[PDB]
Design a protein around this motif. Structure first.
Motif, PDB file in Angstrom:
ATOM      1  N   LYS A 199       5.937 -12.555   8.455  1.00  0.00           N
ATOM      2  CA  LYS A 199       6.591 -11.677   9.416  1.00  0.00           C
ATOM      3  C   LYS A 199       8.096 -11.910   9.433  1.00  0.00           C
ATOM      4  CE  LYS A 199       5.228  -9.127  11.722  1.00  0.00           C
ATOM      5  NZ  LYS A 199       5.305  -9.680  13.106  1.00  0.00           N
ATOM      6  N   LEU A 256      10.915  -9.231   8.924  1.00  0.00           N
ATOM      7  CA  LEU A 256      11.972  -8.944   9.889  1.00  0.00           C
ATOM      8  C   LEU A 256      13.349  -9.162   9.277  1.00  0.00           C
ATOM      9  CD1 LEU A 256      11.396  -8.007  12.856  1.00  0.00           C
ATOM     10  CD2 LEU A 256       9.440  -9.156  11.798  1.00  0.00           C
ATOM     11  N   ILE A 296      14.381  -6.065   7.080  1.00  0.00           N
ATOM     12  CA  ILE A 296      14.837  -4.873   7.790  1.00  0.00           C
ATOM     13  C   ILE A 296      16.153  -5.143   8.507  1.00  0.00           C
ATOM     14  CG2 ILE A 296      14.295  -3.247   9.635  1.00  0.00           C
ATOM     15  CD1 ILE A 296      11.317  -3.544   8.815  1.00  0.00           C
ATOM     16  N   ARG A 297      16.289  -6.320   9.121  1.00  0.00           N
ATOM     17  CA  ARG A 297      17.514  -6.628   9.852  1.00  0.00           C
ATOM     18  C   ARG A 297      18.720  -6.652   8.922  1.00  0.00           C
ATOM     19  NH1 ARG A 297      16.553  -9.558  14.502  1.00  0.00           N
ATOM     20  NH2 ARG A 297      15.133  -8.400  15.874  1.00  0.00           N
ATOM     21  N   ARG A 306      12.133   1.785  16.776  1.00  0.00           N
ATOM     22  CA  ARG A 306      13.520   1.371  16.911  1.00  0.00           C
ATOM     23  C   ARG A 306      14.076   1.814  18.258  1.00  0.00           C
ATOM     24  NH1 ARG A 306      17.000  -0.550  12.864  1.00  0.00           N
ATOM     25  NH2 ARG A 306      15.896  -0.922  10.896  1.00  0.00           N
ATOM     26  N   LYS A 337      16.464  -2.771  15.635  1.00  0.00           N
ATOM     27  CA  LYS A 337      15.082  -3.074  15.278  1.00  0.00           C
ATOM     28  C   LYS A 337      14.549  -4.112  16.259  1.00  0.00           C
ATOM     29  CE  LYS A 337      11.306  -2.622  13.106  1.00  0.00           C
ATOM     30  NZ  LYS A 337      10.748  -3.355  14.277  1.00  0.00           N
TER      31      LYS A 337
END
Ligand code: MG
Ligand code: MG
Ligand code: MG
Ligand code: MG
Ligand code: MG
Ligand code: MG
Ligand code: MG
Ligand code: MG
Ligand code: MG
Ligand code: MG
Ligand code: MG
Ligand code: MG
Ligand code: MG
Ligand code: MG
Ligand code: MG
Ligand code: MG
Ligand code: MG
Ligand code: MG
Ligand code: MG
Ligand code: MG
Ligand code: MG
Lengths: 181, 57, 244, 170
Positions: free
Chosen positions: B18, B22, B25-26, D10, D16
């Motif tokens: 995970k 994360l 995407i961040r 989002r 996010k």
RNA sequence: UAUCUGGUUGAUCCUGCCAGUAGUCAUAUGCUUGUCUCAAAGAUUAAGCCAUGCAUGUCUAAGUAUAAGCAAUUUAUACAGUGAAACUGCGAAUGGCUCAUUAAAUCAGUUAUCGUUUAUUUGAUAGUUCCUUUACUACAUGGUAUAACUGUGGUAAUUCUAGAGCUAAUACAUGCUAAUCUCGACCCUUUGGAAGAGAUGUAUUUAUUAGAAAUGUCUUCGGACUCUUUGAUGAUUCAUAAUAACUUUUCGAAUCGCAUGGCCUUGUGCUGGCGAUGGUUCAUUCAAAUUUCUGCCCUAUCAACUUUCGAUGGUAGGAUAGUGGCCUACCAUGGUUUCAACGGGUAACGGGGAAUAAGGGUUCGAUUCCGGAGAGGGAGCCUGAGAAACGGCUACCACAUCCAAGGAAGGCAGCAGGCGCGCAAAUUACCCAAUCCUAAUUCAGGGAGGUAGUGACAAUAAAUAACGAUACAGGGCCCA
RNA sequence: UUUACUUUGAAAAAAUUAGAGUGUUCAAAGCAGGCGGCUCGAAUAUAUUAGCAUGGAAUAAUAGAAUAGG
């Protein structure tokens, strides 16, 4: 669990305990009133400081204020009831003039010494701690007991005490038995 | 606190997956069955590079 | 939590019950019933901490299941039954009747009443609506639905209910000059007469109340309970008459 | 697997969001019930509380209402003709709310005949296009029920501006 | 940086400087430790790993006993006292522990549900007369059925179970039994009779519909003559009512304890009391879910971010208990930002609070109360009103228990008690009897909780001596 | 004119803090009721910001078919 219950410290260490002035004042006070240690003097000083800070805060407030009138009257009532504050001085200004020595005077030990039941302050402490002193119908074994004006006249020897009318202590009857034998 | 070192990362490999997801995407801006079924180092290499060119020199 | 709670801890219990903080760790959680949890006094507290007839629990239980206690004329056997404001508790064996009414301090007071007064109660009309088959009904503050009400009865009015039959005997409209009781907030327990009802559409309505001493105070409408007209309450009032 | 929770989406600013907690039962979703024309097949679904929902896997008949005449008759379903959301549902003949469907005209025709006795005259006058549909033998109707919820194929026949609009779209 | 001491030279003064000198209250640690009241027990950023034991079961007269159970009896004729086991109902979704993750998220205050579910509690709430095969059970219908139990068996092994035979319901599945109300001609003039014209539950779905100058005459002086006819909110397609159909479609008591009263045409005829448990809908109550506005530490040597794989909005559908890009399809190109968006760090659960301070401020808050999340790490679910539950289930990863090697069984951040070192610290204690909680229920259960025990956590009071007499000597104390 | 700002009133759980009473033998504490109507008794207070109601003349913004035209 069960709800917490509150507790508080009844004394505070002085700001500078090594001032010679403080040491000699404490020497005089302990010797005069037969105090075991300095924690007692610190306790009395803490109580007096709280009282006098309250009185100062009251004297700040405008006269006839409800808070001032009510709680100041309560403070004067408590102080006179304990006997520290005289009946003719029922004002906060005299509360600011109070002292440790007077609260020490109102201690039970000093009173058993003064009334003549004991020949010395230390003898008075012995008698109180020893279960020979009774205020009214109740036996008090605590030198720090603060006596009220009404309770002052009821200090006496306990009914159970050998000095108050009970049978002689163990030493006396032991010596009597040996003498008879 | 999202990506701190853990005492035993192997035991929680699923959790790490995970975190990488994360992280992907961040940081993407910077880059730019059914169980309940009935039947189932660098200094040295630079050093040699300088040497060999110094020879060829 | 994954479901309804079933335990109430003493510090989290209502303050007005006056439960000792060191007696135990839990307090009697009021069961579901006519009144709100925070605005109810469970029968165990009434029988033990107020009347002192029972010293502790199963003696309260035994009192209850001998069927000596009646709430609004009906026998109850649940220890945590949520008795609340204007509830009539009858003990036939001792020949006592009580009405649950807050004192000026804001706590339920032990107020003894006569049998004739015990025969009835008052309910604030929380709602008026037509039911199935075109049948009007009124919902009161204690969750009583009374069908076929008088047309004149509107919300915020007070209906006098007979306990034996559960029917409206009379009603009092919400208007200025009426005698009124405060059932919440810091003014909880005070009694006065209405002066004005300030209205705000989309907001909480505010009411001004003047006591017999001419002191005035303002309170939200949800906290307002009509009890009679000035000088003629329909119920007996505790000592102090809701003053201060 | 299906969840309606908004945490996974989002933020409005585009941030996010991190997983606040595990997925919860009270925010669940279930597979779609792609109702189709055929022999009636319905199975119940135990939902939140003690309530129940009916799933129309298959249904061939439904109650349709002639609103102008104020009547309702049960009728077989011919087939889906036009659906505003998806043409693929029309291709697969999937049944859902708002779908434009063809229904048999026999019961409505027979009722018209019994009531008015015409194949009085002024009242028997009806809009032209629906009469042409009567001649054809099939009527355009809009499903007003939700077959995936109530398990029914009930609706109303198109008329007036509605019918003209859907005829243009057809 | 006050006070106190000292050094700054050949000395003494007066300045200035320098050194030492201070309550902290947090961690660790050393010594000592008599009495009363009392109160707490975290920490390797290791939410690291656990042997053993326990921590959730529950029965009233009132759901089901031919136990070949026990004891009784006027010695038993359907049963009846008590009652193991099992079925059924309820609870186990409360409590307790911890703070991993989380920076407009949680949380605090403050709003909305005219946006939705709600076991349970409390209050109301359902006579539908009739409708051909009546060829008729309602003085009460079936296995479309089984446990416990009898008997035979498999496995090394587990709260494993196979075949056959039995028997019950408040389990499962079915199914019934001369009413009330409008007018009222005619008589009769009231306590009136009624020839006759009429009307008839709920539950689901859709469509439609409703839901807004009688100022007179007479009269007995009263009264009568004609008309009225939904309610609520600031606000609704609200409440409610009506018409037409629709449904693998519901409900409308085939249940139980105590007791034996009243009518007679004397029939085991008719009627009838106090309770329990069920059931449609509404309200109420315990709740749950979203939700309105304001308020979060550090970072700009993070300035543009989000949008391909939903980001902003529109329509329709699907799903949801329900609102909503929650998801699908197609449409537009939107949304946030120097008023700090976005990204990164956080030994970041938040708050009520705690410490200090003269005031402003600064720090702490795992930790006795409120709320949120979790049960080694991810993912998905049955049941049930309520769970994405873990002292419920299934898969995967890491560990790890038994084994006859074929398989089986795991989750102490619950109460005690261990490992993590080779260096260390509370009792594998007693009680459900004070508080309350759970159940069919006074009674049973509750390591929740309490009792006591155990390193001076933090606090209160307070012993370890008091009163005398006698003898001897002349020196004792303070400043400088 | 409206807003900002300011006054007061509701609200902000309990526990904690300050405060009133009470011879737990004193104290730390706990605690709300006594005499036979007695005019006896915690009288209570406390919270920056956001939201609600309310009294405001100044101060700072905000407005005008203001002293317009024939
Ligand atoms: Mg003695
Ligand atoms: Mg919990
Ligand atoms: Mg409103
Ligand atoms: Mg028997
Ligand atoms: Mg079962
Ligand atoms: Mg971050
Ligand atoms: Mg129940
Ligand atoms: Mg069998
Ligand atoms: Mg899309
Ligand atoms: Mg953390
Ligand atoms: Mg905390
Ligand atoms: Mg959880
Ligand atoms: Mg662990
Ligand atoms: Mg259940
Ligand atoms: Mg889980
Ligand atoms: Mg466990
Ligand atoms: Mg659990
Ligand atoms: Mg433990
Ligand atoms: Mg414990
Ligand atoms: Mg160790
Ligand atoms: Mg029962």
């Amino acid at each position: 669990p069960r709800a917490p219950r509150t507790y508080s410290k009844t004394y505070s260490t002085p700001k500078r305990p090594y001032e010679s002035s403080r040491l000699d004042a404490e020497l005089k006070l302990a010797g005069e009133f037969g105090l075991k240690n300095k924690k007692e003097i610190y306790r009395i000083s803490f109580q007096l400081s709280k009282i006098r800070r309250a009185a100062r805060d009251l004297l700040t407030r405008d006269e006839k204020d409800p808070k001032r009138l009510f709680e100041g009257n309560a403070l004067i009532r408590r102080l006179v009831r304990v006997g520290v504050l005289s009946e003719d001085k029922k004002k906060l200004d005299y509360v600011l003039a109070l002292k440790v020595e007077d609260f020490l005077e109102r201690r039970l030990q000093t009173q058993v010494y003064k009334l003549g039941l004991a020949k010395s302050v230390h003898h008075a402490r012995v008698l109180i701690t020893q279960r020979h002193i009774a205020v009214g119908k109740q036996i008090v074994n605590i030198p720090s007991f603060m006596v009220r004006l009404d309770s002052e006249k009821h200090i006496d020897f306990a009914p159970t005490s050998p000095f108050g009318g009970a049978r002689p202590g163990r030493v006396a009857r032991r010596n009597a038995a040996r003498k008879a034998e | 606190g999202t990506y701190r070192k853990r005492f035993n990362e192997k035991a929680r490999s699923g959790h790490m997956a995970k975190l990488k997801e994360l992280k992907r995407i961040r940081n993407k801006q910077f880059t730019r069955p059914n169980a309940n079924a009935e039947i189932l180092s660098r200094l040295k290499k630079k050093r040699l590079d300088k040497f060999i060119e110094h020879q060829l020199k | 939590a994954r479901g309804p709670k079933k335990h109430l801890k003493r510090l989290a219990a209502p303050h007005h019950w006056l439960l000792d903080k060191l007696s135990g760790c839990y307090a009697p959680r009021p069961s579901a019933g006519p009144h709100k949890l925070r605005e109810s006094l469970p029968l165990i507290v009434f029988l033990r901490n107020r009347l002192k007839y029972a010293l502790n629990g199963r003696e309260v239980k035994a009192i209850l299941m001998q069927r000596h206690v009646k709430v609004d004329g009906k026998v109850r056997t649940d220890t945590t039954y949520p008795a609340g404001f204007m509830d009539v508790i009858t003990l036939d064996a001792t020949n006592e009747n009580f009405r649950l009414v807050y004192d000026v301090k804001g706590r339920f007071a032990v107020h003894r009443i006569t049998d004739e007064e015990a025969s009835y109660k008052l309910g604030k009309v929380k709602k008026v609506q037509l039911g199935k088959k075109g049948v009007p009904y009124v919902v009161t503050h204690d969750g009583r639905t009374i069908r076929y009400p008088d047309p004149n009865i509107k919300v915020n009015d007070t209906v006098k209910i007979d306990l034996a039959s559960g029917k409206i005997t009379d009603f009092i409209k919400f208007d200025a000059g009426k005698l009124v009781y405060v059932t919440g907030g810091r003014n909880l327990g005070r009694i006065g007469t209405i002066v004005h009802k300030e209205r705000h559409d989309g907001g909480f309505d505010l009411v001004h109340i003047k006591d017999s001493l001419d002191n005035t105070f303002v309170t939200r409408l949800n906290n307002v309970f009509v009890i009679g007209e000035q000088g003629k309450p329909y119920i007996s009032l505790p000592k102090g008459k809701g003053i201060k | 697997g299906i969840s309606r929770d908004s945490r996974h989406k989002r933020s409005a600013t585009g941030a996010k969001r991190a997983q606040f907690r595990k997925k919860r039962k009270f925010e669940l979703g279930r597979q779609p019930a792609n109702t189709k024309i055929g022999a009636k097949r319905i199975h119940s679904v135990r939902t939140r509380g003690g309530n129940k929902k009916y799933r129309a896997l298959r249904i061939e008949t439904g109650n349709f209402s002639w609103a102008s005449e104020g009547i309702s008759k049960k009728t077989r379903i011919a087939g889906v003709v036009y659906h505003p959301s998806n043409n693929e549902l029309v291709r697969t003949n999937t049944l859902t709310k708002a779908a434009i469907v063809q229904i048999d005209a026999t019961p409505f025709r027979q009722w018209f005949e019994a009531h008015y006795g015409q194949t009085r005259a002024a009242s028997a006058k009806i809009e032209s296009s629906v009469e042409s549909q009567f001649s054809a033998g099939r009527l355009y109707a809009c499903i007003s029920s939700r077959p995936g919820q109530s398990g029914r194929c009930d609706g109303y026949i198109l008329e007036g501006e509605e019918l003209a609009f859907y005829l243009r779209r057809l």
